């Protein structure tokens with residue numbers, strides 16, 4: 298029933314633009330919306346990837362590997378799944394494994410890859426693939442994991458046991474000012490609810 | 492180590508603005524970021540999203556989701572019920588209210604997250620994730636009455652909690668929708684638990 302009628306640029310930065318979206322409502326009435334988009338999406342099936350990295354080690358409980366970074370939009374430190382934008386021509390899987398390695402040092406193995414999922418659909422068109430990767434923490438490659446941050450990347454790695462993920466996140470939030478990412482909290486909540 | 496120095500307005504709509512954030516990197520080099528913010532916050536967070544667990548005896552437990560046209564996406568999305576918190580409303584109250592408006596269900600609060608970020612590389616947007624159970628056998632939830640606000644057009648989709656990820660993949664395959672990243676993350680962790 299509903300569809301887009303027009304998209305008018307309001308303001309275009311180097312990385313983001315704001316648009317006035319005109320669309321048809323399902324009563325047949327024309328309405329508008331203020332829409333955010335990135336300027337960086339070409340032929341990728343999504344803007345970005347986030348990686349769900351399951352660290353596996355003999356005679357260890359499984360950990361979820363998370364990263365902590367300053368996020369200028371938030372004006373503070375955030376705890377997130379490792380993530381980055383997909384380079385032009387890069388597959389989501391390759392992006393995931395590459396970002397995981399850059400941000401954490403770990404060399405993962407692909408497990409699954411979601412369809413494109415929306416980040417904040419009442420606000421932006423931004424999408425990611427959520428890519429689950431296992432990390433064989435008993436492999437020598439993953440013994441001394443060294444993050445390879447790009448220019449202006451400053452990332453800390455935080456690995457938390459899957460079996461206590463939500464309480465461990467709460468304990469970190471209780472100890473300093475930081476925000477947990479909504480996808481991480483969602484995943485931690487489901488692990489409790491299961 | 493890192494912090495915001497200043498914020499420069501680039502452009503301001505009625506609902507969203509774009510800013511140029513200047514921040515200090517960990518080396519002591521000043522850097523810029525294009526940051527999106529809503530114009531509507533006062534509140535603990537911009538919004539709530541509700542994880543509604545529909546409980547009927549002798550039935551599978553379902554998670555109640557909503558499908559709506561999302562003008563920033565250009566299409567239909569499947570999401571947790573959700574909306575912005577009214578000035579002077581608690582996140583809990585916002586959650587029960589939105590849940591009722593969007594689904595017609597009357598629910599009970601189980602737990603409430605701290606403010607969690609939606610897309611912290613792009614925006615400052617945050618929500619509280621509110622877990623709510625719905626006693627599907629109570630008279631008041633027998634014939635759930637959805638009360639759309641002005642311009643809301645919401646379809647209710649309840650899916651069994653035990654098969655959530657497969658059910659959502661099926662909808663994406665058949666219905667050509669976009670699943671929300673938080674919904675997808677939750678569904679993933681229901682499978683990954685144990």
Ligand SMILES: NC(=O)N1CCN(C(=O)c2ccco2)CC1
Pocket residue numbers: 329330331332419420506507641642
């Ligand atoms: N029903 C209303 O009075 N408006 C609310 C939200 N609206 C936007 O444009 C918007 C929100 C986030 C980004 O843009 C238009 C419709």
Ligand SMILES: NC(=O)N1CCN(C(=O)c2ccco2)CC1
Pocket residue numbers: 312313448449523524525526612613
């Ligand atoms: N590596 C760089 O030269 N960039 C610095 C500025 N960036 C932004 O401003 C941005 C992206 C999305 C919203 O803002 C991204 C990375």
Ligand SMILES: [Cl-]
Pocket residue numbers: 490544601622624
């Ligand atoms: Cl529950």
Ligand SMILES: [Mg+2]
Pocket residue numbers: 379380381400
């Ligand atoms: Mg990143």
Ligand SMILES: [Mg+2]
Pocket residue numbers: 380381396399400447450
């Ligand atoms: Mg990166």
Ligand SMILES: [Mg+2]
Pocket residue numbers: 572573574593
């Ligand atoms: Mg809503």
Ligand SMILES: [Mg+2]
Pocket residue numbers: 573574589592593640643
């Ligand atoms: Mg509503």
